[PDB]
Amino acid sequence: AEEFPVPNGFESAYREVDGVKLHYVKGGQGPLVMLVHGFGQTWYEWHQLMPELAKRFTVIAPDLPGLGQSEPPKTGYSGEQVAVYLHKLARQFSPDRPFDLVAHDIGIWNTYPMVVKNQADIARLVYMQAPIPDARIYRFPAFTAQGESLVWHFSFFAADDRLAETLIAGKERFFLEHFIKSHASNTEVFSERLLDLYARSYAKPHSLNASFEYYRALNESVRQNAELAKTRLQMPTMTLAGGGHGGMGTFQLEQMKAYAEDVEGHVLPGCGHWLPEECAAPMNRLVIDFLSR
Amino acid sequence: AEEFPVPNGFESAYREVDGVKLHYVKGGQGPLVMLVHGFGQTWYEWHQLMPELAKRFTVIAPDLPGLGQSEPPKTGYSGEQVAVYLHKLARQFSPDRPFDLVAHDIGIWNTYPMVVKNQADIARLVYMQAPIPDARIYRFPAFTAQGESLVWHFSFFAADDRLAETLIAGKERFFLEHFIKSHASNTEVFSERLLDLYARSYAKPHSLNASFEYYRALNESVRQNAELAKTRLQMPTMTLAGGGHGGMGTFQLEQMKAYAEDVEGHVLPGCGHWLPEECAAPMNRLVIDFLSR
Ligand SMILES: *[C@H](CC)[C@H](O)C/C=C\C/C=C\C/C=C\C/C=C\CCCC(=O)O
Numbered sequence: 212a213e214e215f216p217v218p219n220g221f222e223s224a225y226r227e228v229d230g231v232k233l234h235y236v237k238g239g240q241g242p243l244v245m246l247v248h249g250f251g252q253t254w255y256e257w258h259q260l261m262p263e264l265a266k267r268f269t270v271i272a273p274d275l276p277g278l279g280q281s282e283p284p285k286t287g288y289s290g291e292q293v294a295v296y297l298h299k300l301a302r303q304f305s306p307d308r309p310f311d312l313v314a315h316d317i318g319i320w321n322t323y324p325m326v327v328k329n330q331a332d333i334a335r336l337v338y339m340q341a342p343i344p345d346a347r348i349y350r351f352p353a354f355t356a357q358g359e360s361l362v363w364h365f366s367f368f369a370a371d372d373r374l375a376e377t378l379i380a381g382k383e384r385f386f387l388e389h390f391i392k393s394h395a396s397n398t399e400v401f402s403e404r405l406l407d408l409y410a411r412s413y414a415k416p417h418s419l420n421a422s423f424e425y426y427r428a429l430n431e432s433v434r435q436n437a438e439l440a441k442t443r444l445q446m447p448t449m450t451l452a453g454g455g456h457g458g459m460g461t462f463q464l465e466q467m468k469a470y471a472e473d474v475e476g477h478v479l480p481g482c483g484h485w486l487p488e489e490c491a492a493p494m495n496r497l498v499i500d501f502l503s504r
Numbered sequence: 505a506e507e508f509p510v511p512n513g514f515e516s517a518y519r520e521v522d523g524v525k526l527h528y529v530k531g532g533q534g535p536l537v538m539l540v541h542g543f544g545q546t547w548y549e550w551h552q553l554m555p556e557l558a559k560r561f562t563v564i565a566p567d568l569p570g571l572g573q574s575e576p577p578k579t580g581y582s583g584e585q586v587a588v589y590l591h592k593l594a595r596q597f598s599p600d601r602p603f604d605l606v607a608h609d610i611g612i613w614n615t616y617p618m619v620v621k622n623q624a625d626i627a628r629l630v631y632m633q634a635p636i637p638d639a640r641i642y643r644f645p646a647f648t649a650q651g652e653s654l655v656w657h658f659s660f661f662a663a664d665d666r667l668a669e670t671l672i673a674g675k676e677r678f679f680l681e682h683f684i685k686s687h688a689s690n691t692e693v694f695s696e697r698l699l700d701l702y703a704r705s706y707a708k709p710h711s712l713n714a715s716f717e718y719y720r721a722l723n724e725s726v727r728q729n730a731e732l733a734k735t736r737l738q739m740p741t742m743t744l745a746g747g748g749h750g751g752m753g754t755f756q757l758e759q760m761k762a763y764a765e766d767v768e769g770h771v772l773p774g775c776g777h778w779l780p781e782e783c784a785a786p787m788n789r790l791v792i793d794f795l796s797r
């Protein structure tokens with residue numbers, strides 16, 4: 212039983228990290244690159260990049276704790292707690308050399324603490340489509356002159372009483388299609404089959420709850436990061452952001468400039484939030500080139 | 505056939521206005537005062553203030569179109585379309601004299617245009633707990649350092665594909681309790697019995713949909729008021745806002761000073777959104793004193 216199709220030459224496997232059984236898909240040879248997905252998705256969002264990267268690198272794509280086929284965390288869902296799991300997972304496979312890190316959406320939240328605290332273990336960093344949790348997220352408007360905003364899910368998912376689980380249960384496929392397409396610039400890349408796969412995966416009760424616990428921990432992650440951010444990142448970093456509807460535009464690079472000394476960014480026109488699927492080829496190309504320099 | 509208990513000496517009745525049958529509760533004698541409820545509730549939110557006002561006033565409390573026992577509007581749900589219905593209803597009972605207006609929450613949205621277009625018809629005005637729809641609402645934050653903001657429902661309710669009705673159907677009783685209490689400071693007044701009453705009213709399918717149609721017309725209402733705001737209100741007005749969790753605090757009066765020449769404002773400590781219920785004694789006293797001047 213696999214929730215998503217594994218590409219040729221890759222292996223679906225599990226590893227215990229601090230008592231928590233983590234699922235991942237792994238292939239390739241060479242220095243290690245870890246790819247970390249975001250909300251609504253799983254390791255599978257990288258399935259197009261992974262065979263290309265695996266020509267020059269060892270590639271590992273974990274499911275975040277509680278999501279996909281990984282067990283929920285036993286400590287908690289703030290960035291610092293989850294980052295321990297992802298760091299220790301990567302160390303098992305690259306204990307003698309730095310590794311590269313590519314992260315999308317809440318993968319950023321869940322990896323930034325381990326990067327800033329183990330800078331010598333990270334060779335190069337790619338961050339795409341999510342603010343690092345800090346005071347800036349408090350400025351994002353709740354409502355726009357065009358209709359619903361793109362960040363009101365922060366409060367919906369953070370709300371207590373299990374509000375999001377209760378309202379979305381029974382309607383997981385419907386809600387996820389609306390959520391994805393409303394943050395997408397190009398909706399045609401999400402077939403009905405792909406949406407069925409993602410919806411069945413996050414509809415598992417523990418995965419549905421886990422998805423929102425990351426947001427229930429968001430303010431704790433902001434407070435954690437106010438102390439972490441006294442140390443700027445020193446490794447080579449690239450940011451990617453969509454330039455169309457759902458994309459973060461210039462905010463991604465401009466925020467990262469406050470955290471990183473050596474940073475380059477790109478904004479991809481015609482693309483929204485789901486860069487690996489909406490703009491697979493140009494994103495794949497910029498990732499591979501940046502990590503191969 | 506009453507969704508809520510009519511107070512002693514009042515009558516539940518209906519008036520056809522522009523093809524639309526509006527429900528209302530009415531009692532008392534003297535100059536007319538109209539009380540307009542907001543989202544999540546009906547005329548019944550006024551049922552404690554009405555017996556007191558009726559000692560000196562003719563009091564009418566209609567259900568907004570689509571909500572309570574009132575038919576949906578045949579024109580639409582923008583502030584200027586709904587305000588026609590309420591102006592016409594009031595003027596059937598007060599054709600020869602100005603009347604007083606008290607509005608709560610989206611009652612403000614649905615009365616402001618008729619007040620500015622017919623200033624000689626409004627003797628005194630009391631607005632509580634809502635922004636008048638304008639560009640200020642596009643700066644309300646999606647997310648706060650305390651947690652979920654109070655205004656993210658703007659985007660939730662406005663979202664297309666009938667997102668809100670689709671998620672909330674079958675869970676209307678659960679959602680109303682969460683929504684009401686999360687916007688309250690004095691939550692203990694929302695007994696299960698009272699929550700049952702309001703939930704069975706807005707859970708009527710055309711009422712659940714009507715509820716969100718007001719938010720789907722909000723951007724139109726914003727654009728309508730942009731023209732109308734070029735003329736400031738000339739009649740004595742009072743604003744009330746909660747000072748506690750769910751209250752709008754100083755925003756209510758500060759925004760109203762841009763719209764009204766003659767305006768006094770009160771912030772009530774320990775009270776959130778639902779002033780008639782959370783803080784009946786101070787609120788009723790404030791409204792009665794203001795209107796009797
Ligand atoms: C993952 C999203 C699925 C994570 O929760 C959020 C990360 C990115 C945020 C979503 C994309 C767009 C965000 C920034 C746009 C800039 C300002 C937004 C404010 C108002 C609006 O137009 O939405």
Ligand SMILES: *[C@H](CC)[C@H](O)C/C=C\C/C=C\C/C=C\C/C=C\CCCC(=O)O
Pocket residue numbers: 542543544609610633634635644645648652653654655687750751752753755777
């Ligand atoms: C009816 C609400 C049930 C209507 O849709 C909205 C009117 C009232 C909203 C209730 C509370 C709003 C309180 C806060 C206003 C203050 C500043 C705006 C930003 C909100 C925030 O949480 O920071």
